[PDB]
């Protein structure tokens, strides 16, 4: 028995051990109470505005579109405190945890960005924060690990299984099943058991709300399409949510194609996966033929979630949103193009969304179209990764 | 479940609790696993609980996590597990066999086809670790259509409304994992639940006798068996001898 | 003959080879015209708002001041595009250059931050950009050099003299004396020959203008002091300018003390220098007894300007502003304190200003005082520097 | 400047232009520099322009930048330069000596005291490279109070208003560095400027004759001498021979 529908069509649900269900129900109830509470909204809005930097700018990109009939805007989540959209929702979840009377935060992270976001939110609000991280990911992300420790977070390396996100996530859930009386589990994307897909969307929907008001002010019309990259799906659903009922607005999610879909090394479960049950939810996922969960691959570690949020699977199935893929090489080129012609260094994650926009513009250069790309993060974190690849190509 | 009904009637006629070991199928290799299981049965296990190796065991501690890794290392697949199960049943026609599964392995090729395959090889019960009662309808309905008992875990943080659903939805036995045990056992008896087996950290002969005396129909040793495997990996002959001594001590403790 | 006074009391002037004076006079005239031109102001304001992220937030720091009577705010220039206040004025100078009909940008950089700012501004506005940099600085700042090249800037290493800022600056001036017909020299701080101290101030004064309006809205009163770190002086004069006539507002500039003033290895020319003539201006500078120019030292490479802007020397002399120093160790501690209790990673430059505020609070914890610190940049650039020092201390 | 007046009167009586080499004092060492200067004078230099090594030569090309580095490497200081100047004058009482300075070396211990020290050692003129005429008042006033000629550079991008100020403020000679040369020379003659020396890239005997024929009273070789030093660092004996041959060729070209 839940207050909210845990399913989006057939996708979603609460597929967790029985022991965890009191924790999810207590969370759903606190969320519903908080959503109706003007005091909660005013505190949340105050942190977003005076600490994180909202509202973010909507930047027109004339240089990139010259000689076409495409007008392109970037929603500048790279200007948010912390350098990525993740900040919006960790601040909401951290306030929610305080409202529930919790004093500890549990999180898991792969590339480290959700680790950093969880740690800065816990430092600000006086929460004790422990972060589980795969030992293979710990080695590869010493910058982000140091950041987390500077901010007072305990980083618990996990020496189990494949030492990747999966062991940590599973260790984080196990931790939470014992500690949920005092601790809140801060899930990092719009996936997982209900009510997390719903909560993470609602704490990201200001992205699309600001974008609607800002585009109406600057162009007097809604865009023809909004384009966002899709890992687990939080920045995309944050951009999409306020446009869902505006059926003339295309919604385009971009998954990583890796080296190519045909090669097998990619991260597009929504379009090349199979419905399964994992991580508390029923959703398209990448799995072997006898049902083991596969790792997704992408030059952008931030898009390596082996599934996708259930609301995206639902939007695809009814035809409200379209999901495409973009390869590593297409993403790097869009990265270089933005640096050179606008002076913005984008995250390699966000470069997938930009690359698809550049493709829509370049394939049909006389098509008149107003596009918005959600620039979900800045790419200072990717400077070394891009450099090594550009050197290995004699560039 | 019919095997379970027979099992518990005989055990009641002897004023005796059930002792149920858990092991992962194929750990540490297919041939050694089959030897382990035969050893546990000869030493007096009343029933078996068997795990199928899964990539993301979200409800399992580190001891079982490593057990799954060894089985994967040895090339064990779901299909191989089912061949192992047909062989175990052919050799031991009366012992109840319960599977501990994760939902995706059940769902992968069709929920109904998974329970049909359990019925064919002679499995008696299935516990899906990451399906709570609130989501269990398509699983327990497929279980009942193929004469498989659906097992549910009754957690420590359980409340009265969960107790009635577990008592009403489960068959075979109730997996017991706050509220004073004794109460839990009498409430479940009040609601006519399947017999309760205590499964939380049963690792010494004394806990086995404490559970049976507290009202439980027996005890499940969730990881103590897997530890003995992990201790004696380098000497299969010593592994078996330690398993036979531990199990026969636990079984003695239930009379 | 100039339109504007090139002196602040006795400091300032235009001490350049005769050949360069037409270039400075042409620049002063274009600036004065642009200042009166509403069209120029609207274009500048539009770039600041829709591309750089202005206005920046004013963040209250309750966690840091708990148990004192200090209220502390941070003016969040770390949230500006590019991660530092430098962006404000390169956008102004790049627009000014276009207004003059120039098409090339010349700049010099040490730690690389002004190089990056000049390159992003040139990329945005379609200018060709060449950056002179000391070969010793090129080695130590491969990240920033790569950034500059990604943005289309030519980075000209200088194999002369000490291979530091000085050879590049001198090479940049020499370049400009030949090319000023088509090229604009984008000086990086509020120093140099007139009219650069005046121009750089005016293109940074929105920092203090926003701060005044934001503090009046949030507290209903002006601060007791505004505190800013001082390298060449642009972020400080940007914060100070709008408060100069509010004589109840203390103005506090913070210079690097390095390992300590008494050791000789520091960067506080304003308080431990001697008036001289260098880089086109008469100002306090660090010089040997027979008048050679010394290098300044600081853990923060961004504060290593061997002189200071002439308006700061003037404000000190009349007693309108006070200038103090802060050592490396005091700055690192303030760095750690902000990370741990507010979740903001500050630039080591800005950490000097924060450290002095923390000292004012801690020495007199029952003094009621409203302080604003100009958080001039974010410290992702300093993460490795801080890490190596913390490791070399067993921490 | 009185030495300059005498110099130019004699040169006019011989229908002859002046050739003025530039070197950095103390490059590549104190003793070798004194030998270089004696060599340039014996070979027919009419006057000298001498640089004092400064840390930040903001108006100097790379050839002179390196010359300063060598002098710094050899421990040369301003005080040592002034001792060198007293020695040069004692050995050559009639040759005009001009200094090329940067403002901070002039300003460091007092503007008036610097020009007093120039007068004491017998320096005839001072050019401060980074003081434009607009900022020159305290420098030229101190120069005139100590009978030092202030030298100004008349740049290529010069205009008529600058021409009148250079003609009015300078003494000794005018340093010539758009506008057709010939015009510049007649405009300066119109305003009664000190005699103009051409100083832009004079590196062959032909430019020397071209400058004198175009109206200039002579030519300053701004860096060609310093190159010969830099070419022959390893063989001081060859350095001197190349210097004596170059200078005597340039001087021949001015008659």
Short mmCIF file of N, CA and C in Angstrom, two decimals, chain D residues 16 21 35 38 73 76 86 89 97 100 125 132 151 158 162 164 168 171 177 180 189-190 198-199 218:
data_model
loop_
_atom_site.label_atom_id
_atom_site.label_comp_id
_atom_site.label_asym_id
_atom_site.label_seq_id
_atom_site.Cartn_x
_atom_site.Cartn_y
_atom_site.Cartn_z
N UNK D 16 80.72 65.08 -43.04
CA UNK D 16 80.88 63.76 -42.45
C UNK D 16 79.74 63.49 -41.48
N UNK D 21 77.98 53.45 -32.18
CA UNK D 21 77.62 52.10 -31.75
C UNK D 21 76.95 52.09 -30.39
N UNK D 35 87.62 46.51 -22.93
CA UNK D 35 88.42 46.30 -24.13
C UNK D 35 87.60 46.54 -25.39
N UNK D 38 87.18 50.39 -25.89
CA UNK D 38 88.43 50.94 -26.43
C UNK D 38 88.60 50.57 -27.90
N UNK D 73 74.89 37.90 -15.36
CA UNK D 73 75.65 36.70 -15.03
C UNK D 73 77.05 37.05 -14.53
N UNK D 76 77.45 42.35 -12.91
CA UNK D 76 77.45 43.79 -13.14
C UNK D 76 76.29 44.44 -12.39
N UNK D 86 83.61 56.25 -15.32
CA UNK D 86 84.69 57.17 -14.94
C UNK D 86 86.00 56.76 -15.60
N UNK D 89 85.95 57.71 -19.47
CA UNK D 89 86.13 59.15 -19.68
C UNK D 89 87.55 59.60 -19.42
N UNK D 97 79.47 60.57 -24.56
CA UNK D 97 79.00 59.32 -23.98
C UNK D 97 77.53 59.51 -23.61
N UNK D 100 71.70 54.77 -22.15
CA UNK D 100 70.35 54.30 -22.42
C UNK D 100 69.87 53.66 -21.13
N UNK D 125 74.78 62.55 -22.05
CA UNK D 125 73.35 62.52 -22.34
C UNK D 125 72.73 61.25 -21.77
N UNK D 132 57.96 58.55 -21.91
CA UNK D 132 57.55 59.34 -23.09
C UNK D 132 57.62 60.83 -22.75
N UNK D 151 67.69 62.92 -24.11
CA UNK D 151 67.48 62.42 -25.46
C UNK D 151 66.09 61.80 -25.55
N UNK D 158 55.02 58.97 -35.45
CA UNK D 158 55.02 60.30 -34.90
C UNK D 158 54.11 61.23 -35.63
N UNK D 162 53.94 65.78 -31.53
CA UNK D 162 55.10 65.14 -30.92
C UNK D 162 56.41 65.75 -31.44
N UNK D 164 57.09 68.79 -32.42
CA UNK D 164 57.39 70.05 -31.75
C UNK D 164 57.87 69.84 -30.32
N UNK D 168 61.54 70.67 -28.99
CA UNK D 168 61.66 71.68 -27.95
C UNK D 168 62.31 71.13 -26.68
N UNK D 171 67.91 67.69 -26.26
CA UNK D 171 69.19 68.34 -26.50
C UNK D 171 70.17 67.29 -26.98
N UNK D 177 63.72 56.84 -34.96
CA UNK D 177 63.39 55.42 -34.99
C UNK D 177 62.56 55.04 -36.21
N UNK D 180 57.46 60.06 -44.55
CA UNK D 180 58.73 59.85 -45.25
C UNK D 180 59.91 60.49 -44.53
N UNK D 189 64.31 70.00 -38.58
CA UNK D 189 65.17 71.15 -38.84
C UNK D 189 64.37 72.45 -38.72
N UNK D 190 63.13 72.44 -39.22
CA UNK D 190 62.24 73.59 -39.10
C UNK D 190 62.01 73.96 -37.64
N UNK D 198 69.77 58.64 -37.23
CA UNK D 198 68.95 57.50 -37.60
C UNK D 198 69.38 56.27 -36.80
N UNK D 199 68.42 55.58 -36.21
CA UNK D 199 68.77 54.50 -35.31
C UNK D 199 68.06 53.20 -35.60
N UNK D 218 73.83 61.43 -38.85
CA UNK D 218 74.58 60.23 -38.57
C UNK D 218 73.63 59.09 -38.27
#
